[PDB]
Design a protein around this motif. Structure first.
Motif, PDB file in Angstrom:
ATOM      1  N   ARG A 268       7.599   1.690 -11.048  1.00 51.31           N
ATOM      2  CA  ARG A 268       6.578   1.451 -10.241  1.00 51.31           C
ATOM      3  C   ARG A 268       5.196   1.261 -11.182  1.00 51.31           C
ATOM      4  O   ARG A 268       4.540   0.350 -11.075  1.00 51.31           O
ATOM      5  CB  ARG A 268       6.363   2.393  -9.197  1.00 51.31           C
ATOM      6  CG  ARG A 268       7.639   2.268  -8.261  1.00 51.31           C
ATOM      7  CD  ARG A 268       7.125   2.898  -7.062  1.00 51.31           C
ATOM      8  NE  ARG A 268       8.286   3.026  -6.171  1.00 51.31           N
ATOM      9  CZ  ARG A 268       8.369   3.786  -4.978  1.00 51.31           C
ATOM     10  NH1 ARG A 268       7.280   4.111  -4.516  1.00 51.31           N
ATOM     11  NH2 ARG A 268       9.568   3.693  -4.036  1.00 51.31           N
TER      12      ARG A 268
ATOM     13  N   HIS B 239       1.473   6.727  -6.922  1.00 54.05           N
ATOM     14  CA  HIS B 239       0.334   7.668  -7.281  1.00 54.05           C
ATOM     15  C   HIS B 239       0.680   9.009  -6.987  1.00 54.05           C
ATOM     16  O   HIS B 239       0.472  10.079  -7.813  1.00 54.05           O
ATOM     17  CB  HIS B 239      -0.899   7.564  -6.543  1.00 54.05           C
ATOM     18  CG  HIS B 239      -1.544   6.027  -7.072  1.00 54.05           C
ATOM     19  ND1 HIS B 239      -0.966   5.495  -7.860  1.00 54.05           N
ATOM     20  CD2 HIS B 239      -2.735   5.387  -6.381  1.00 54.05           C
ATOM     21  CE1 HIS B 239      -1.698   4.379  -8.173  1.00 54.05           C
ATOM     22  NE2 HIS B 239      -2.682   4.150  -7.086  1.00 54.05           N
TER      23      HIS B 239
ATOM     24  N   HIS C 212      -7.430   3.323  -7.733  1.00 51.75           N
ATOM     25  CA  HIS C 212      -6.365   2.893  -8.757  1.00 51.75           C
ATOM     26  C   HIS C 212      -6.869   2.527  -9.996  1.00 51.75           C
ATOM     27  O   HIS C 212      -6.143   2.672 -11.028  1.00 51.75           O
ATOM     28  CB  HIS C 212      -5.651   1.545  -8.092  1.00 51.75           C
ATOM     29  CG  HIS C 212      -4.776   1.132  -9.017  1.00 51.75           C
ATOM     30  ND1 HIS C 212      -4.379  -0.118  -9.085  1.00 51.75           N
ATOM     31  CD2 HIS C 212      -3.390   1.718  -9.383  1.00 51.75           C
ATOM     32  CE1 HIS C 212      -3.304  -0.487  -9.675  1.00 51.75           C
ATOM     33  NE2 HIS C 212      -2.737   0.773  -9.840  1.00 51.75           N
TER      34      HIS C 212
ATOM     35  N   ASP D  64       0.763  -1.155  -0.038  1.00 54.66           N
ATOM     36  CA  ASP D  64      -0.006  -0.127   0.070  1.00 54.66           C
ATOM     37  C   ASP D  64       0.777   1.217   0.000  1.00 54.66           C
ATOM     38  O   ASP D  64       0.422   2.195  -0.648  1.00 54.66           O
ATOM     39  CB  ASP D  64      -0.919  -0.043   1.409  1.00 54.66           C
ATOM     40  CG  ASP D  64      -1.956  -0.943   1.186  1.00 54.66           C
ATOM     41  OD1 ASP D  64      -2.242  -1.721  -0.083  1.00 54.66           O
ATOM     42  OD2 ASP D  64      -2.733  -1.088   1.949  1.00 54.66           O
TER      43      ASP D  64
ATOM     44  N   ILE E 205      -4.428  -1.811  -4.727  1.00 56.69           N
ATOM     45  CA  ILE E 205      -4.267  -2.149  -6.154  1.00 56.69           C
ATOM     46  C   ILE E 205      -5.785  -2.344  -6.951  1.00 56.69           C
ATOM     47  O   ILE E 205      -5.657  -2.545  -8.266  1.00 56.69           O
ATOM     48  CB  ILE E 205      -3.556  -3.316  -6.347  1.00 56.69           C
ATOM     49  CG1 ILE E 205      -4.068  -4.553  -5.797  1.00 56.69           C
ATOM     50  CG2 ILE E 205      -2.014  -3.025  -6.034  1.00 56.69           C
ATOM     51  CD1 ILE E 205      -3.244  -5.776  -6.170  1.00 56.69           C
TER      52      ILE E 205
ATOM     53  N   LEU F  87       2.564  -1.953 -11.828  1.00 55.24           N
ATOM     54  CA  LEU F  87       1.225  -1.834 -11.430  1.00 55.24           C
ATOM     55  C   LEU F  87       0.438  -2.064 -12.654  1.00 55.24           C
ATOM     56  O   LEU F  87      -0.859  -2.407 -12.392  1.00 55.24           O
ATOM     57  CB  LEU F  87       0.904  -0.238 -10.875  1.00 55.24           C
ATOM     58  CG  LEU F  87       1.513  -0.168  -9.399  1.00 55.24           C
ATOM     59  CD1 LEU F  87       0.793   1.384  -9.012  1.00 55.24           C
ATOM     60  CD2 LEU F  87       0.994  -1.163  -8.286  1.00 55.24           C
TER      61      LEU F  87
ATOM     62  N   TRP G 113       4.034   1.427  -1.078  1.00 59.22           N
ATOM     63  CA  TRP G 113       4.606   1.499  -2.377  1.00 59.22           C
ATOM     64  C   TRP G 113       3.590   2.052  -3.453  1.00 59.22           C
ATOM     65  O   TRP G 113       4.117   2.859  -4.084  1.00 59.22           O
ATOM     66  CB  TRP G 113       5.192  -0.085  -2.872  1.00 59.22           C
ATOM     67  CG  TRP G 113       6.175  -0.133  -3.669  1.00 59.22           C
ATOM     68  CD1 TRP G 113       7.482   0.006  -3.758  1.00 59.22           C
ATOM     69  CD2 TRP G 113       5.774  -0.521  -5.064  1.00 59.22           C
ATOM     70  NE1 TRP G 113       7.961  -0.363  -5.039  1.00 59.22           N
ATOM     71  CE2 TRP G 113       7.006  -0.547  -5.729  1.00 59.22           C
ATOM     72  CE3 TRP G 113       4.519  -0.789  -5.908  1.00 59.22           C
ATOM     73  CZ2 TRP G 113       6.927  -1.040  -7.055  1.00 59.22           C
ATOM     74  CZ3 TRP G 113       4.621  -1.038  -7.095  1.00 59.22           C
ATOM     75  CH2 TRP G 113       5.865  -1.347  -7.824  1.00 59.22           C
ATOM     76  N   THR G 114       2.388   1.336  -3.612  1.00 59.19           N
ATOM     77  CA  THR G 114       1.457   2.019  -4.836  1.00 59.19           C
ATOM     78  C   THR G 114       1.271   3.435  -4.511  1.00 59.19           C
ATOM     79  O   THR G 114       1.045   4.278  -5.230  1.00 59.19           O
ATOM     80  CB  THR G 114       0.464   1.273  -4.946  1.00 59.19           C
ATOM     81  OG1 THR G 114      -0.708   2.029  -5.105  1.00 59.19           O
ATOM     82  CG2 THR G 114      -0.069   0.333  -3.793  1.00 59.19           C
ATOM     83  N   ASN G 115       0.712   3.974  -3.244  1.00 59.87           N
ATOM     84  CA  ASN G 115       0.324   4.940  -2.968  1.00 59.87           C
ATOM     85  C   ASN G 115       1.375   6.118  -2.944  1.00 59.87           C
ATOM     86  O   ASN G 115       1.224   7.333  -3.342  1.00 59.87           O
ATOM     87  CB  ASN G 115      -0.229   5.236  -1.274  1.00 59.87           C
ATOM     88  CG  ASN G 115      -1.387   4.550  -0.913  1.00 59.87           C
ATOM     89  OD1 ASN G 115      -2.152   4.299  -2.145  1.00 59.87           O
ATOM     90  ND2 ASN G 115      -1.658   3.827   0.079  1.00 59.87           N
TER      91      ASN G 115
END
Lengths: 29, 97, 48, 72, 35, 146, 150, 62, 21, 119
Positions: free
Chosen positions: B42, B19, G141, B12, G136, B46, B14-16
């Motif tokens: 990244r 963004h 997303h 979370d 995700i 994703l 890492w993805t956030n």
């Protein structure tokens, strides 16, 4: 399996429908 | 179960952060090539992480187009191309000019 | 010979091109295959 | 506009429509509409009825019907 | 195709409890816990 | 699922599959008017005669790869007809449909689309109609991107 | 073997830096933020619902009141939803009345398409207002990757 | 005496590994318990207003 | 469904050709 | 053992969601009006106690907020986090007025002294 081999060769390697010509016959599988 | 929680927390974060950094790169609030090159990495992951879902779901969910729609569009092009007298493209002849 | 006699192809690498508003996917096809697709691309558009 | 519509509507229904002599609500001028008391703002119509003797919003069609009852 | 992947039974307890999703602030940052 | 657009011939695949959906939105009747007779095709946006031009509300069509422009010409009667067809599906006594409309706020206030609910509903109506002409399983034509 | 690039398997400890354990061990170099600042201390005002006065205020009652007001708050929004809807609805009634009054004042092509009505079934698919706890697969997303991959 | 044993449920889309509680507080009346969770929610607990000793009895059992 | 449409389309084209020529 | 005093059951009645990381800390304002909450999304969220509505999200920690205390005697909220920061938030401005620096690693907890001006 040879029955369905012969069947699908009538489905795959035919020339295109836009040419017309008679359909190849198929078999009931 | 303990490991899975921390992997999802790292996930979370890492993805956030992907963004957040991309909004900076869109807005222009960042001019560091390493941040952009990092973030593209990244986002590439994703994407594929979701594209692998999409390709798996297709075989699981089956054709999203119905057999009704597919024969509708198929017959439509036959009626078109027939009325256009379209002669279908042959395979390149062995001695084509 | 390729268009008649093969249907299994080497893996396609993927990459993204970083236009800051939106990423575009980029693919690298194997060089021996690109020359066949490029002729076919040329052939298809001429005939069509 | 709504003011001239209500006069026109009262006129075709034969209802009395004219201002009360120096009667006001919220400082806006109160009108007679048959037996009913009316004031207008913002393309909306307000009415009092003897169910509550206080002011409620109204739509013009049932306003005609309410006066059509009250005139009888 | 986007729609959903996840359970409703938790949302059935949401008949008995105030489930909230709250991604925005009821006052601006300048509204200063009234002095 | 889907085609690798990085193939050399992927442009041909996309253009031909695009043509299939041009037939859907035009229909073969209007598509064959716009294309004209296959012996003497029309050139771009031209027609064999004024009669075929007038004979349908779709006057012009082009597709740029995956982007489509359609030109509609309507009499007031068939426009208001289509509005009723649309509002029969998606009625709006609240003026909800006009506040979600896209407007080119870059242009001046008189070049921005009018507030008139008739004109706004006509645009909504043809978009609703067009959005129904082709499967949501093939392509997702959508209001925010149109 | 490589071993210098190791993490903290061993525990961290402290409490022996500059000025710790003896006040004279502060060096006369001090950091820029160690300047005196905010030196007038603020305090909460008198009558701030202080604990003993709150206890007297049978403190459950003040919370109970506000919980009940939250129920009243829901019904207030329904009234405001009614107020906004009827006014623009009456505006249609005005234009309808005006249209009829104008008359009384005088008294004073797509069948070729092979697909149709695909929308006639999608109203079951409206998006619910919920927080999917999965970064995700959150709606954000899905919306994000569609915006940026083009 | 442990009179109640709640088990919290992870809110939708979270894994069963995320049930954990990381903090809790009582409100200043002492009648609302606020708990902070590994599933990224805040859950709040309230005394059951209608319970009474004879509905939920305690004996002696030393 | 597509294979039977291939069957049907091909003989429809042939018959309409045979009726013309 | 000896005789329990009887206590009523507790039931779940609200679930506020809106943190994007683990909610690590919670504390209640002395007047019971609102409670703060820090989380692993490095954000402190102030929520209304009676209605659950998110008043304010205060951002400024570099990483996870995992201690949060509202001062009983001051208009201050104190918070600390895995970034080694400890911060005094002046609630009359919603701004970080003071930092307390010396921690060598992640701040796990903090407590504000009930009668001294001591943290």
């Amino acid at each position: 399996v040879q029955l369905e081999l012969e069947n699908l060769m009538a489905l795959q390697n035919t020339e295109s429908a836009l040419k017309g010509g008679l359909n190849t016959p198929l078999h009931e599988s | 179960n303990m490991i899975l929680r921390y992997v999802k927390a790292k996930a979370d974060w890492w993805t956030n952060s992907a963004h957040y950094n991309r909004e900076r790169v869109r807005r222009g609030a960042t001019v560091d090539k390493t941040v952009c090159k990092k973030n593209l990495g990244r986002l590439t992951r994703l994407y594929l992480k979701s594209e692998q879902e999409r390709q798996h779901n297709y075989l699981k969910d089956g054709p999203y187009i119905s057999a009704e729609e597919a024969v509708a569009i198929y017959t439509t092009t036959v009626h078109w191309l027939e009325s256009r007298r379209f002669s279908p493209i042959p395979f390149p002849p062995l001695s084509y000019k | 010979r390729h268009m008649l006699t093969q249907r299994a192809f080497k893996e396609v690498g993927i990459e993204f091109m970083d236009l800051y508003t939106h990423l575009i996917p980029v693919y690298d096809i194997e060089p021996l295959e690109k020359v066949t697709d490029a002729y076919l691309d040329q052939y298809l558009w001429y005939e069509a | 506009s709504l003011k001239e519509i209500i006069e026109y509507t009262a006129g075709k229904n034969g209802f009395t429509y004219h201002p009360q002599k120096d009667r006001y609500k919220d400082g806006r001028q109160v009108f007679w509409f048959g037996a009913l008391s009316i004031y207008l703002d913002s393309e909306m119509v307000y009415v009092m009825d003897p169910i509550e003797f206080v002011w409620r919003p109204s739509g013009l069609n049932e306003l005609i019907q309410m006066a059509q009852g009250a005139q009888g | 195709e986007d729609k959903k992947y996840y359970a409703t039974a938790l949302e059935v307890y949401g008949e008995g409890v105030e489930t909230l999703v709250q991604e925005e602030d009821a006052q601006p940052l300048t509204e200063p816990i009234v002095k | 699922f889907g085609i690798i657009r990085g193939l050399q011939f992927a442009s041909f695949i996309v253009q031909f599959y695009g043509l299939v959906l041009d037939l859907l939105v035009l229909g073969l009747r209007r598509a064959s008017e716009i294309a004209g007779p296959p012996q003497c095709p029309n050139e771009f946006l031209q027609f064999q005669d004024v009669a075929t031009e007038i004979g349908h509300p779709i006057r012009l069509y082009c597709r740029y790869i995956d982007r489509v422009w359609i030109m509609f010409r309507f009499s007031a009667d068939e426009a208001r007809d289509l509005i009723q067809r649309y509002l029969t599906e998606h009625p709006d006594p609240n003026n909800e449909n006009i506040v979600g409309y896209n407007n080119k706020k870059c242009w001046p206030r008189d070049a921005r689309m009018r507030l008139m609910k008739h004109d706004v509903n006509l645009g909504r109506a043809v978009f609703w109609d067009i959005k129904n002409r082709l499967p949501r399983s093939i392509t997702t034509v959508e209001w925010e991107n149109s | 073997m490589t071993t210098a690039h190791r993490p903290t398997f061993h525990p961290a400890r402290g409490g022996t830096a500059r000025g710790e354990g003896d006040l004279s061990k502060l060096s006369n170099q001090y950091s820029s933020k160690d300047m005196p600042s905010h030196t007038k201390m603020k305090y909460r005002q008198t009558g701030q619902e202080t604990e003993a006065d709150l206890r007297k205020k049978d403190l459950r009652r003040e919370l109970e009141d506000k919980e009940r007001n939250a129920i009243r708050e829901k019904r207030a929004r329904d009234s405001a939803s009614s107020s906004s809807s009827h006014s623009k609805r009456q505006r249609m009634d005005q234009i309808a009345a005006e249209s009829a009054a104008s008359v009384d004042a005088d008294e004073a092509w797509d069948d070729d398409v092979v697909f149709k009505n695909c929308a006639k079934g999608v109203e079951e698919r409206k998006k619910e207002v919920t927080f999917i706890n999965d970064a995700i697969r959150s709606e954000f997303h899905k919306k994000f990757m569609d915006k940026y991959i083009k | 005496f442990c009179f109640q044993k709640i088990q919290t449920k992870p809110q939708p889309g979270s894994i069963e590994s995320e049930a954990g509680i990381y903090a809790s507080c009582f409100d200043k009346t002492g009648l609302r318990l606020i708990t902070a969770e590994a599933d990224k929610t805040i859950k709040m607990y309230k005394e059951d207003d209608e319970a009474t000793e004879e509905s939920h009895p305690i004996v002696w059992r030393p | 469904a597509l294979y039977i449409a291939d069957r049907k389309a091909r003989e429809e084209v042939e018959t309409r050709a045979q009726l013309e020529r | 053992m000896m005789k329990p005093k009887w206590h009523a059951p507790w039931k779940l009645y609200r679930v506020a969601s809106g943190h994007t990381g683990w909610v690590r800390a919670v504390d209640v304002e002395p007047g019971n009006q609102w409670f703060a909450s820090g989380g692993a999304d490095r954000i402190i969220k102030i929520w209304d106690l009676a209605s659950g509505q998110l008043k304010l999200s205060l951002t400024g920690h570099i990483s996870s907020v995992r201690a949060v205390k509202v001062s009983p005697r001051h208009p201050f909220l104190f918070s600390g986090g895995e970034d080694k920061q400890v911060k005094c938030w002046d609630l009359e401005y919603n701004k970080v007025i003071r930092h307390y620096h010396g921690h060598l690693s992640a701040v796990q907890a903090l407590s504000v002294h009930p009668s001294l001006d001591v943290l």
